[PDB]
Amino acid sequence: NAMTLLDGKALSAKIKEELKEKNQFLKSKGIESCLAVILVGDNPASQTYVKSKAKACEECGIKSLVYHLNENITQNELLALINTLNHDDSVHGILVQLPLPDHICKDLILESIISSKDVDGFHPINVGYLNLGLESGFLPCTPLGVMKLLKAYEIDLEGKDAVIIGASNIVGRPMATMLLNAGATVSVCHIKTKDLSLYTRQADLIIVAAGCVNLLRSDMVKEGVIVVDVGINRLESGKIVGDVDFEEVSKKSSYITPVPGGVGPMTIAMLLENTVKSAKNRLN
């Protein structure tokens, strides 16, 4: 029953070192990897997350440009900025920090980012490439980070029974697609699923990205399961937990991500890696 923590904090640190070296090379070729981040309005969490992303860029040799736009910006004004960034050869990645204001249509904004700078992998053509099984185009950061974490621990996915809880565009759908591409059998469950346990009790691998504290319990899993917790939930006490009942589920798991320090750091690492990927594409 020897449980192993999937230490995304440690892996993300290793990746940042790797990127710092890549960036030294790129800079010697006259390429300064650069991520533009657009933050709209004054959402407090968003401020903090963007600051973290900028700090992570600086640590690994990526130039960051943060654009602080008014909460009342019109949709066309936001599109105009993205158009500018799309044509700026010095910018390799463009990220729009979510959530946008209620009066902005996310899907239209995201499709307006040039697909060659779409480091979140949200553009419809990048979604399409991934679903076609092509995994050289930009892949979304959170599920890509999960795949990299699993690969680092030498976890073989072929033939595995995998369950993804949550069917979001940001995580659940691309996560299922990456696992299917890797040869796993995949089930995608969500709030309308009649009985989650029917699926989870048979699973070799469970990815939980459902936004609900203690959604995954020990009686819902079999011994030896690999558990990946994408959840970030703040309790009334201020304690951060995932979507998994970690204390009990960890007892039954062969490998499990802690929260904090699991998926979270890996998502940032992949943002960085995707930006460096775009920058490297500029080499002759």
Add this chain to the structure above:
Amino acid sequence: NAMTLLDGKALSAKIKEELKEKNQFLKSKGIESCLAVILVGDNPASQTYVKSKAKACEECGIKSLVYHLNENITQNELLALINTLNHDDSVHGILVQLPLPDHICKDLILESIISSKDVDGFHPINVGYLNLGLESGFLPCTPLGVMKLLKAYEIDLEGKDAVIIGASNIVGRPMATMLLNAGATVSVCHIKTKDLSLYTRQADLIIVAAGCVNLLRSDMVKEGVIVVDVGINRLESGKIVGDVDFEEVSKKSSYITPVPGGVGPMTIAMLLENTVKSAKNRLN
């Protein structure tokens, strides 16, 4: 208990009559819906399929342009034809009959079709739109036809435990995505799945697209299951069957598609519908 045949042949015929009427009105306003079909080489099955598509177009007032190219044409020649068709305002849909010869890159050819005439829904941006749960593209004809057939019987998909056997780009992947969009829990099984029957025995709905005679047997399903058979397999005897053991599975099914006369006719009907949809878009 009562079993009902999901009669795709009858539904398809009604759709064709509906499109013939729509095309009479379109033609009176100067638009003649037109599909270009490109067939490379002389694969006998392919020639049969193309003749079927051309016949169906004629039945519902769609003009067909069939380009029958030599198997030895270059990738460049094919691209050049598709470029011409992309720019021909009198052509509303472009379909390339698969498979292509080995020396032609399928992915490149499909992405070269302008997405607004991509009636097969294979272009990466159309795959992306579907996966994002958007309605701004073309959807692939086989899974779309399955959804239309289910809807014709008012089959409620929310919360259903669905299993899709086969993870192809033509059927399985978009099928799973359409079912997930409709609120079903979806499992995608394939050649690397350890125990297919574990999944099928619990399913409310099974879509089979595996190309294997008698893959789905009665001991693999529960009473009341809905079974959709995308297979078209020709026996030694000459009789056409699906991937389902229809004689036995039908006894346990609440709804089941016969073969022939189930999915097959609907796939063609959706091609015609997608073509007319494109033509209707071109109105001033």
